[PDB]
RNA sequence: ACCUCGAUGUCGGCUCGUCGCAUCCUGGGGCUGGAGCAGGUCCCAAGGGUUGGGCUGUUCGCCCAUUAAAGCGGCACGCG
RNA sequence: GCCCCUAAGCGUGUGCUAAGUGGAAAAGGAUGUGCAGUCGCGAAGACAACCAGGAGGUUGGCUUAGAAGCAGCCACCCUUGAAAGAGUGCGUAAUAGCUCACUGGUCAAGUGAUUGUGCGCCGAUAAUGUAGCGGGGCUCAAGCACACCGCCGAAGCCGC
RNA sequence: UUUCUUGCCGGAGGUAGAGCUACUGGAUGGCCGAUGGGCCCCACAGGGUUACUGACGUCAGCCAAACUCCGAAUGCCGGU
């Protein structure tokens, strides 16, 4: 509705092809496919913009208009520039290192834990205390980020674990 | 996660939502979290 | 103090009875009766929405001019019947009045002002009786209280009134009373 | 219990018109 | 705990619980009041609980009026006894209430506090109720 | 605020401008209450320092030929009226602005024509 | 007091089962006035297990040594 | 009573239902949804969202070891204003801070409340085997409400 | 046909309802309250100059099978 009203601009270095309801985008970073909801139709403005229209004004159409617009915008942005996410570590004797396409952690357990890299995603580490994750699909990047974050249980006393750049975790002190 | 027939916005920061037909309230403070059931 | 009549449309009833009245009320018309010194009772119908709007706008006592099949009559709402639960206008009483008559009309009173910390306001009487001509009946009467202490019994006769209005009620009536603020001990003692 | 409640609520059928012997 | 001083007759039939209240259907002692919707036998202890609940939250100012009095009695016979052998003895007193009857009345400057106190009172009664004001 | 209040404010500034010789426009964003009060006290000897709303001043400017200042009302705007002389208040606001570094003068009006910031600086120097 | 008085035989114990979860252990979580071991409360879960003795005919109950525990109930107060 | 078991309508027109409610129930709780009537604000820029200011007597008096806006009681006064409430709270023994209430700058029309009603959700849970539609099955109603056309239906009435 | 049904006409009641300064009781809040029908000096004379009681009165809002100033539809007797 309000969010979906604005047509999505298309940069010059972006190739767009439409085949009925299926939508595909070709760009420098790669290509991806898409499927659009049946009740909503999508049209390509000749001036280099994407137009999404709704036939009715009921609940489902109103809800789906904004979803489709935002999803298309995310897809175009991702195929254009990409997506990245970086983390950081806290504690004593906590380290990370890279081995080929895989990644190894050291959270203080009796054994080291390994993480497998799925397709279309690459890990990058610059320091033993800070590393980064890069990819093209925002949903996949978020999924892997959440999986990485969930490794260690929350600790509101010493804050040992992993978290995002500016994330603030509530902490309380145990006097005893 | 309290479970009571009645759920209310205990503080001025709670927000009431609905999930899978069950009405539950979420808030920044963990204590303020409960659901119907 | 002058007021202007309010216009409404009325129709002559076709049938009389509890069933007919119930049907009319369900349809959305409130039955009413027009009687007065003219010795010619008539029973009519009014539009519920318009009647409620007029009452809300101009209080309980309002001057109404009716269009009875092209004839104009001046009427006053003498009394009303309201269902205790559903809160509808079950029936209305209309009294014919011509300009230059003396009528007895009950008018509500309101209290506004500020009170001292040890002062609590109580309203024993909510309405008073006043005599005035049809077109100058006030819609509200106000009494001001400011910085009173201890016993400050406000007498009905002590109320200031406009010109051309006579206080039918005796001056002995008490309307507003002011007493010392209560206390927890008294509150607990009462009711046991 | 369950048995008693079943019968008395079974009298609300279309045919019986709301009245059934033995409640 | 409200009880009558004495009654001409000590054992009576069950009060009739049919119809709609005719008298006392309007509230004029203060500013806010309560009116009932259902039928029930309000008890003296329930009245006391409601009054205490209102008072403990209203604290300093205002005052409360009660428009009913549980004078009509009810009887109960000793447990583990066969039927017959005469009527029982009076145990608790009740007040008959019908829809439209006004129970409590409160006058207080602050509308928010008044309504909060009234709701606290309503939650202690065995029947549904609605808050009504003085104005038509 | 009510429509009567907005009309009253419009008339108030209209008569204030009529009684004033000239005026200047400045930005009051990022100034603490202490320094605002200090500036008000300093300027209270001759001129007056207040705050005017963009749309309200735009409407009140229709009466006079100061409509050319419409383009200068973008963003926050604090209005000052020089009831007494012209250059004292201008130099005071210039010195305060250069001292604080958080205030930028949008412009001013005199002689029936709007003037750029350079011209405002030159006339304040004069 | 509705079936059974030209008969519906009975309290405990022994042998033999079967079902519910309102859960004793084992299994998975939320919140803590959760530093850790150890604790309080709520949520999901019925696959498996749930000892031997002193006292009274007992039901019920107290006590002696163990383990993870020594669960609550229904089936004519299961079963002549 | 008319989808099949089974004789007859997978009938016609207009609306509601997302829960298998239909085919079990209460005090009470809630941004589910349709209809009818309101007041306030909204082109003089509404609501949310995204930059700045949110102050001086002042730590207001009693109380306490302690009380500074935030265990408690009385006013709940006032200057500067755009706005400061003896302040709704999650903050420390007590200060100090994160803030907030009303308001300014950027986007551009809906935004709130109760009022009365049709349908719905949670509250819901006992022992041999689903077992609270008769079975299969049905939201492409074969469910609910208002109007219209027909049929099947007994030892009832008519016919010999 | 003296039985029964319908219309019309003449008949006595005391329920439902409702009401209370209309009698007997229960009872909610106000007002002056002399005189608690009565207590700081007991003066034989100022007031709870003091938070009471306050009668009778009066403002308003109620309840009753063994209360009724009121009071129906059915029901019953008689006539056509
Ligand atoms: Mg029965
Ligand atoms: Mg009555
Ligand atoms: Mg109740
Ligand atoms: Mg028998
Ligand atoms: Mg026998
Ligand atoms: Mg035998
Ligand atoms: Mg035996
Ligand atoms: Mg369970
Ligand atoms: Mg466990
Ligand atoms: Mg616990
Ligand atoms: Mg188990
Ligand atoms: Mg198994
Ligand atoms: Mg069993
Ligand atoms: Mg046997
Ligand atoms: Mg046995
Ligand atoms: Mg057994
Ligand atoms: Mg057994
Ligand atoms: Mg067939
Ligand atoms: Mg069909
Ligand atoms: Mg339709
Ligand atoms: Mg359900
Ligand atoms: Mg059902
Ligand atoms: Mg229910
Ligand atoms: Mg509720
Ligand atoms: Mg602010
Ligand atoms: Mg102060
Ligand atoms: Mg305090
Ligand atoms: Mg409604
Ligand atoms: Mg069926
Ligand atoms: Mg026959
Ligand atoms: Mg004859
Ligand atoms: Mg008679
Ligand atoms: Mg008698
Ligand atoms: Mg009666
Ligand atoms: Mg009496
Ligand atoms: Mg009354
Ligand atoms: Mg009786
Ligand atoms: Mg009687
Ligand atoms: Mg009789
Ligand atoms: Zn909260």
Curated annotation (Swiss-Prot), chain A:
Molecular function terms from GO: rRNA binding; structural constituent of ribosome
Keyword match Transmembrane helix: no
BP-aspect Gene Ontology terms: cytoplasmic translation
Pfam families linked: Ribosomal_L6 (PF00347)
Keyword RNA-binding: yes
Domain of life: Bacteria
PROSITE patterns: RIBOSOMAL_L6_1
Keywords: Ribonucleoprotein, Ribosomal protein, RNA-binding, rRNA-binding
InterPro entries for this protein: Ribosomal_uL6-like (IPR000702), Ribosomal_uL6-like_a/b-dom_sf (IPR036789), Ribosomal_uL6_a/b-dom (IPR020040), Ribosomal_uL6_bac-type (IPR019906), Ribosomal_uL6_CS (IPR002358)
GO cellular component, one term: cytosolic large ribosomal subunit
UniProt cross-references to NCBIfam families, sorted A to Z: L6_bact
Job of this protein: This protein binds to the 23S rRNA, and is important in its secondary structure. It is located near the subunit interface in the base of the L7/L12 stalk, and near the tRNA binding site of the peptidyltransferase center.
Assembly information from the UniProt record: Part of the 50S ribosomal subunit.
Family indicated by similarity: Belongs to the universal ribosomal protein uL6 family.
The name this protein goes by in its record: Large ribosomal subunit protein uL6
Protein species of origin: Mycolicibacterium smegmatis (strain ATCC 700084 / mc(2)155)
Lineage of the species this protein comes from: Bacteria, Bacillati, Actinomycetota, Actinomycetes, Mycobacteriales
Swiss-Prot record, chain B:
GO biological process: translation
Keywords recorded for this protein, A-Z: Ribonucleoprotein, Ribosomal protein
Gene: rpmJ
Protein name: Large ribosomal subunit protein bL36
Species of origin: Mycolicibacterium smegmatis (strain ATCC 700084 / mc(2)155) (Mycobacterium smegmatis)
Source organism phylogeny: Bacteria, Bacillati, Actinomycetota, Actinomycetes, Mycobacteriales
HAMAP family assigned: Ribosomal_bL36
A cellular component annotation (GO) from this entry: ribonucleoprotein complex
Keyword hit for Ribosomal protein: yes
Family membership: Belongs to the bacterial ribosomal protein bL36 family.
A GO MF term: structural constituent of ribosome
UniProtKB/Swiss-Prot annotation, chain E:
Renumbered residue ranges of the record's region Disordered: 1-24
Keyword tRNA-binding: yes
Organism: Mycolicibacterium smegmatis (strain ATCC 700084 / mc(2)155)
GO biological process, one term: translation
Assembly mode: Part of the 50S ribosomal subunit.
InterPro entries noted in UniProt: Ribosomal_uL16 (IPR047873), Ribosomal_uL16_bact-type (IPR000114), Ribosomal_uL16_CS (IPR020798), Ribosomal_uL16_dom (IPR016180), Ribosomal_uL16_sf (IPR036920)
Function noted in UniProt: Binds 23S rRNA and is also seen to make contacts with the A and possibly P site tRNAs.
Record protein name field: Large ribosomal subunit protein uL16
GO cellular component: cytosolic large ribosomal subunit
Keywords per UniProt: Ribonucleoprotein, Ribosomal protein, RNA-binding, rRNA-binding, tRNA-binding
Compositional bias annotation for Basic residues: 1-13
Lineage summary: Bacteria, Bacillati, Actinomycetota, Actinomycetes, Mycobacteriales
Family under the similarity heading: Belongs to the universal ribosomal protein uL16 family.
One Gene Ontology MF term: structural constituent of ribosome
Disulphide connectivity of cysteines: none
TM ranges: none
UniProtKB/Swiss-Prot annotation, chain F:
Record keywords: Ribonucleoprotein, Ribosomal protein, RNA-binding, rRNA-binding
GO biological process: translation
Gene Ontology molecular function: any one: structural constituent of ribosome
GO cellular component, one term: large ribosomal subunit
Family recorded in the similarity comment: Belongs to the universal ribosomal protein uL10 family.
Its biological purpose: Forms part of the ribosomal stalk, playing a central role in the interaction of the ribosome with GTP-bound translation factors.
Description of how the protein assembles with itself and partners: Part of the ribosomal stalk of the 50S ribosomal subunit. The N-terminus interacts with L11 and the large rRNA to form the base of the stalk. The C-terminus forms an elongated spine to which L12 dimers bind in a sequential fashion forming a multimeric L10(L12)X complex.
Protein name as it appears in the record: Large ribosomal subunit protein uL10
Lineage summary: Bacteria, Bacillati, Actinomycetota, Actinomycetes, Mycobacteriales
